[PDB]
A paper describes a structure:
Bacterial [name], a metalloenzyme involved in carbon metabolism, is essential to bacterial glycolysis and the generation of metabolites used in several bacterial cell processes. [name], a multifunctional metalloenzyme, catalyzes the dehydration of 2-phosphoglycerate (2-PGA) to phosphoenolpyruvate (PEP) through the intermediacy of a stabilized carbanion. Herein, we present novel crystal structures of [name] [name] in complex with [name] and its oxidized derivative, KSF where the C5 hemiaminal is oxidized to an imide carbonyl unit.
The binding mode of [name] in [name] [name] structure is similar to that of human ENO2, the only other reported crystal structure of [name] bound to a protein. The hydroxamic acid mimics the carboxylate of 2-PGA coordinating with Mg1 as well as hydrogen bonding with Gln166, Asp316, and Lys392. The same interactions are observed between the phosphonate group of [name] and the active site residues, however an additional interaction with Lys341is formed. No formation of Schiff base-like adducts between Lys341 and the hemiaminal moiety of [name] were observed in this structure. While [name] exists as a racemic mixture in solution due to stereocenters at the 3- and 5-positions, it is noteworthy that in our complex structure with [name] [name], only the 3 S,5 S configuration is observed. Additionally, the hydroxamic acid of [name] serves as a more stable metal chelating group forming a 2.1 Å bond with Mg1, approximately 1 Å tighter than 2-PGA. Moreover, a 5-membered ring chelating complex formed between the hydroxamic acid of [name] and Mg1 as compared to only a 4-membered carboxylate coordination in 2-PGA, reflects a more stable and tighter binding event. [name] exerted potent inhibition on [name], with Ki values of 3.4 nM.
Author numbering:
A (entry chain B), B (entry chain A): -7 to 430
Write the structure that this text describes.
């Protein structure tokens, strides 16, 4: 007899704009407005060590604005043709909305409008549709995911010591992370992260080392080896009153594609030694023997599938092996990885593929195969906390959203705290059990 | 005959919670919910080099949580006594809401509930009431301020090189900043900042200096003197293709309190040389003749009032002299400063005094005496962008909200971008003429 406003979920307006990300580079933000007055707003993140098979960002390449990194053309895609194609459509139909943008762009890698333009609209849409349905984003996402009412709070892998490309040290491994698997709630996990992070600063200050931070809020001190990184962390964990290996485990992102040349892995700060696939795998195995490293990400080059089959054979029963640049959140690639015994986990980055619908498809493929899914940030982030709702709504079980500093990271932890406060034990923090091989 | 929901502006619930700030320390967030369904949310920032006379930030001191920096007591204050005193009150009456909290705390420095508790609610209340009136925060702020429909976009001062206490170098001056006075819009100002910040990273790398960032997203490289901080900024400005003095002026925060002992200013990075108050003023003066430094903040110790009078005589006709620790956003102190010819500008930090109403009284006192007001962040921030709305809605003319990295900073620039998009020339960017002494 009376039609409520929630039923008026047709798109009446889409606005795009150029804003600034956490590294000072432009990004695209979109607003999606519905007939009933609901609005969602979202922005695209941006990677610094991008896989070669990622969907493509659209930048302007004008050297007189933002050193060629403007996104005014992606913004005009949002305001002109994306807007045109979606006005009149039901935001609640996420898949239909995404399919429209994908077909209109027409390219394999979203190179006409940019995966940045398309993703920002895909996420803003989902938020507008959640508002129209009278629910928080995490709840809407679970329904779009095919898993209505099923939540978990994820176990975070928190970056605290950095190496590799553009880190003034002899550390080759791009990220060393702590995971507070002994916490009972995500709120306690976050407190634990914070305590270790502040104790690490004290440790590094006592060694004379630098405590300024990188892109992800963690430290990049002048260390002498990949091993010294694991030791300062061990020292910080103990000063915080926690036990390495039962309260807190360790995870790594090697970003090994960055040090792979002419078929060998070159460890620039490890006497500059060169390694085969098989040898770099054994170098990693030994590290997991000396330290409670339970997860290793991109331990070989994104094209070294023979090498990944062997790493999975050696380490996979015991260690989570996370493909990032390996799978680029792409179902066509993940599929083949699964069929070939390649890795046992996937890092989920929605701007690697460019839409929410295809991101949920990757999570689903992974879970169907017994692979774990770790929801992730990019180096370039914004104040947007969408990956927190996403992690909870897909019950992914793990998240990777930075150190315990910079609001580009901390906003996601804050949102995890608001969501857990609301769900309580309807969103269990499962701890060590989430991690492939425990 | 029918009442809108907007008229149901009575408070029905206030929730407080403990979240995390951009340094990894706890802070207070509050939600104010009104009968008509309107909700506002805000969080208190936190200083790192606080004035002696700031209102009190209440922390817990429990070593078992966050190294003693929990805010559960301030949170309990929000949830219990503050909520009980505000339920049933009209959120549109900001002065009346704040008065209730102030009278109920009962202390001069808000040391019973914490200025962090009271501020979070004061801001949250204002946001909820903005929504209840059907308007953006900046517009509501202008109406609260007694200046309805009067707006400007602030000229930002952007902190790109760091020294002082939280900086691992021999630069004594806490902050070196650029101001893009030559810009025509804030959007362009922001673009200029980003470009200069990226060119600075290249300049610093070519000198083999570290390009990681401190709390405010600026660089803290190992420079030999205070003057060398100015010189590398001028390389970066030129390498970005801008003209120092015309497109971009310079500003500084001395935080000179931090290096005052036994009545002298000791510059650890001009080889421990001790300066009388007047010689330090001469030191500053000499920098302003070498570089187009147009603003100097906290150039003497907060209690060195005779020094400040002197500094005002020497510098105040040509240079903006900003009291931060000197005035602590406190009308009692600022009044006395106005009376004594002390400074000509005030840094406005709402958590130094504890309420929006008292903040607006500080801005008004400044402007009534011809002093400029610069709305400011603290080192410890969140994803909250309230100071952008506050700057525009009071037409303050200036903002200090950090470097062009970290979303604890960039969120504020982004919100300035959204506001300028909505207002256009209803919110002029006035450029250099905002700065006291031009
Ligand atoms: O490889 C990476 C970088 P990127 O910016 O996403 O490339 C940061 C992220 O933690 N991760 O897994
Ligand atoms: O003195 C200060 C520090 P604080 O954290 O607020 O003390 C950072 C800010 O720019 N300002 O003016
Ligand atoms: Mg990468
Ligand atoms: Mg990675
Ligand atoms: Mg200070
Ligand atoms: Mg200051």
């Amino acid at each position: 007899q009376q039609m409520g406003r929630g039923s008026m979920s047709k798109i009446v307006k889409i606005i795009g704009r150029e804003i600034i990300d956490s590294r000072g580079n432009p990004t695209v933000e979109a607003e999606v407005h519905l007939e009933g007055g609901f609005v969602g707003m979202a922005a695209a993140p941006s990677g610094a060590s991008t896989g070669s098979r990622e969907a493509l960002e659209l930048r302007d390449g004008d050297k007189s604005r933002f050193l060629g990194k403007g996104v005014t053309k992606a913004v005009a895609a949002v305001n002109g043709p994306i807007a045109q194609a979606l006005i009149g459509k039901d935001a609640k139909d996420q898949a239909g909305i995404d399919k429209i943008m994908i077909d209109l762009d027409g390219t394999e890698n979203k190179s006409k409008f940019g995966a940045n333009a398309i993703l920002a609209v895909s996420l803003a849409n989902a938020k507008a549709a959640a508002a129209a349905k009278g629910m928080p984003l995490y709840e809407h996402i679970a329904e779009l995911n095919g898993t209505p009412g099923k939540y978990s709070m994820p176990v975070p892998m928190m970056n605290i010591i950095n190496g590799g490309e553009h880190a003034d040290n002899n550390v080759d491994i791009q990220e060393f992370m702590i995971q507070p698997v002994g916490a009972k709630t995500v709120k306690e996990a976050i407190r634990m992260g914070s305590e270790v992070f502040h104790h690490l600063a004290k440790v590094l200050k006592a060694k004379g080392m630098n405590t300024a931070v990188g892109d992800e809020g963690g430290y990049a001190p002048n260390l002498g080896s990949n091993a010294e990184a694991l030791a300062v962390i061990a020292e910080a964990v103990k000063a915080a009153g926690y036990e390495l290996g039962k309260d807190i485990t360790l995870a790594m992102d090697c970003a090994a594609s960055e040090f792979y040349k002419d078929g060998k892995y070159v460890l620039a700060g490890e006497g500059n030694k060169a390694f085969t696939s098989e040898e770099f795998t054994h170098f990693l195995e030994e590290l997991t023997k000396q330290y409670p490293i339970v997860s290793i990400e991109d331990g070989l080059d994104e094209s070294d599938w023979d090498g990944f089959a062997y790493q999975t054979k050696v380490l996979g029963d015991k260690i989570q092996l996370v493909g990032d640049d390996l799978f680029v959140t792409n179902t066509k690639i993940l599929k083949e990885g699964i069929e070939k015994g390649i890795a046992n986990s996937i890092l989920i980055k929605f701007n690697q593929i460019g839409s929410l619908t295809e991101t949920l498809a990757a999570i689903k493929m992974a879970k169907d195969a017994g692979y774990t899914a770790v929801i992730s940030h990019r180096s370039g982030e914004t104040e947007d906390a969408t990956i927190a709702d996403l992690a909870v709504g897909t019950a992914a079980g793990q998240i990777k959203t930075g150190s315990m500093s910079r609001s580009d990271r901390v906003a996601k932890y804050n949102q995890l705290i608001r969501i857990e406060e609301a769900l309580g034990e309807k969103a269990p923090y499962n701890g060590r059990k989430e991690i492939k091989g425990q």
